[PDB]
Structure formats: C-alpha cells, structure tokens
Amino acid sequence: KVFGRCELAAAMKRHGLDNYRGYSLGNWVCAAKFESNFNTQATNRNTDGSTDYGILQINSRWWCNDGRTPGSRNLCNIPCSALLSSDITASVNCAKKIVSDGNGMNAWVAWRNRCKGTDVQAWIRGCRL
Ligand SMILES: [Cl-]
Ligand SMILES: [Cl-]
Ligand code: NA
C-alpha cells in the first residue's frame, strides 16, 4: 500500500509515534517519505547483502529475519515480510525499538540527511489529526 501523507501521519499517531522518545510526528512522516516514498512494499538491497524493508526501511542485518542475511540478528523478532504489510503495526513497533537503542532517529540515513534540522512540522501541516 502507498500511503498518503496525512493518512500515514494519522496512522502513526494512532500507533503512538507522535513525540515518541521526543520525536514529533513530522519527523516520522519525513523519514517514511524519503526512505520508502510512503510505500509499504519497498525493498532495497545493501552492499553487505542485507536488505531494507517496508515503509521505514528496517534492515535485515539487525532487526528482522529474511532467511538470507547470514549472521544477522532478529531484534524485532519478526520475519522481514511482516514489515511489508499494509498494516503498519509491525513496522511501527519495530521502529520504536530502533529509536530507543541510543542513536535516536540517526539510524535512518535519510532522516539524518534530509529531515534532521529541517522544518519537519511541514510534513503534518494541513492534516486532521
Ligand atoms: Cl512535527
Ligand atoms: Cl540520504
Ligand atoms: Na495501518
């Protein structure tokens, strides 16, 4: 499923991401935009053979199991395919674990390079939340 901007914002808010660990909702929407273009089915292969999955491009080296990233951890204890569902619950619950691990949203390269230090509230402007 390809989310609309306000649709996703509303779904992330209902799943508790607004101000989770201090990150306002605009940060999460901005990250999703640049990681996956709001597409829950996005996948991208990394140089090290791991793969990024879903709307927040969660990495199989650490966070989910795709059966083909040897020596990888499965810290969200889910199959990576669960992160491609139109229901964002699994991606959101896993993202909560990622952002709490110490580095905050710097774990998402696109957030660091394209959202951090920008007017991220613009991403939820005009949405009925
Ligand atoms: Cl915001
Ligand atoms: Cl980037
Ligand atoms: Na959903």
UniProtKB/Swiss-Prot annotation:
Catalytic machinery residues: 35, 52
Localisation: Secreted
Domain C-type lysozyme residue range list: 1-129
Alphabetical UniProt keywords: Allergen, Antimicrobial, Bacteriolytic enzyme, Disulfide bond, Glycosidase, Hydrolase, Secreted, Signal
Tissue spec: In the egg white and polymorphonuclear leukocytes.
CDD domains linked: LYZ_C
A Pfam entry, by short name: Lys
Organism domain of life: Eukaryota
GO MF, any single term: identical protein binding
Further comment found in the protein's record: Lysozyme C is capable of both hydrolysis and transglycosylation; it also shows a slight esterase activity. It acts rapidly on both peptide-substituted and unsubstituted peptidoglycan, and slowly on chitin oligosaccharides.
Protein name: Lysozyme C
UniProt source species: Gallus gallus (Chicken)
